């Protein structure tokens, strides 16, 4: 039977799903680790013990315990990102979509969800793998990993809550794919890992970590890179935040053993309810529990690993959206709201820059302000609003990604860079947010090909072209068809630095993506903050 597969962990039974008037098979909710519950909370994951009988893989698994966005009750713009399943600490599962008939040895793509390392689910509607598996004939996998304190509480030195366990969860799912994807018809020597935001930063983290590099072949990073300012903290900061969490739950703080024991007695929601209270500054685009530079998963600092070429050398394809910062200002900066144009006064502008660069002293804040203020028209509320949107996106996503890309390309085997700037015609968020963080995902997973979703014909075309670049790059290391007549996406080089736009108009090639602002964020500001 096509829906029954025998793997090294036991037999699983799938289910047949319709997609674009045809069908494929789906194996949903396959377990790859023991449930990380009770005494296992905060611990490295254990491999799932093989089972007898047939594992029913016909429905979605639970989503991991996480904070839930209630900022706009009933609004589908925010709700489509919340868990659409019951939450549970028993949540380590993966999902596989496989063409029909079952391939023998085809290209594999493994998706790693974003969500600031504090939230996220593999089961969201926008992450449905069936359009991509079907349209490009690839075996599509999506994994899951613990987030929040459950996945990243870090008391370096203890083996009970070492930190990075959420990254070890992703690594285990990658190990399981390496070991069993052949039975579903996938080629384990041709797997591409791809992810967005924290998912994109995770991808870059597996390219860096010696223990993860042998498990995949190529990588795709969307709006995220390993060195982003919000993606990691030192062991000292990790520890300080773990103790502060403990202090919020009135825990005994005399020892790691006593702190960890107290935290393990708490119900999930108790930790989620005070999680935000441990950030060290009033800030936006900062999350409490994230990867920690421990000397194990990351042998040395990320910067020196990048300088010396200490990382997997392969091809990578990555990029950004035009208005990455708008989501974070909407949610936490004074003067912005969902239903107005959000024109910003000089004073809210000033409040906004303080919140966006929380680690800067006064001279630092002054440099940023000067760099983004048009002094011939300083009270223009639209310029102040967009100015703030660019500060958040440049500092948190684009410039860190450009620094990663310039360091990688020096040692890698091929880089392709894109700049996604098409605003979907059916977006429910207001116009001022532009091309929002996260909205290139629906085009990557092919949602524009389903008519009932209301996209235009050129949007369906944009989506087919993106799906075909991603899958062709996964199969071959190059997004371009060998003899196509279509326009070429050129290779990004240390010398020329070319990249392309991704939108409904004819591809245009450009150079030095946001180079003026990124020399400010990557070279000047850090030198100004170290000297003062
Ligand atoms: C990739 O590596 C192969 C052999 O290791 C080499 O022939 C080719 O020039 C490389 N491509 C790039 C863009 O570095
Ligand atoms: C497992 O799949 C769904 C889960 O609710 C349901 O039809 C039934 O419980 C199971 N089906 C089979 C074939 O075991």
Protein described:
- By secondary structure, the chain is an alpha/beta fold.
- It has one domain: 3-Layer(aba) Sandwich (Rossmann fold).
- It is 35% helix and 16% strand.
- It has 17 helices and 16 strands.
- The strands form three sheets. An eleven-stranded mixed beta sheet has the order 3-4-6-8-7-9-10-13-14-15-16, sandwiched between helices.
- A hairpin with a 6-residue loop joins strand 15 (498-502) and strand 16.
- The longest helix has 31 residues, at 381-411.
- The radius of gyration is 23 Å and the shape is globular.
- Bound molecules: 2-acetamido-2-deoxy-beta-D-glucopyranose (2 copies).
- It catalyses: acetylcholine + H2O = choline + acetate + H(+).
- Keywords: Cell membrane, Disulfide bond, Glycoprotein, GPI-anchor, Hydrolase, Lipoprotein, Membrane, Neurotransmitter degradation, Serine esterase, Signal, Synapse.
- Disulfide bonds join 64-91, 251-262, 399-518.
- InterPro entries: AB_hydrolase_fold (IPR029058), AChE-related_enzymes (IPR050654), Acylcholinesterase_fish/snake (IPR000908), CarbesteraseB (IPR002018), Carboxylesterase_B_AS (IPR019826), Carboxylesterase_B_CS (IPR019819), Cholinesterase (IPR000997).
- The active site is at residues 197, 324, 437.
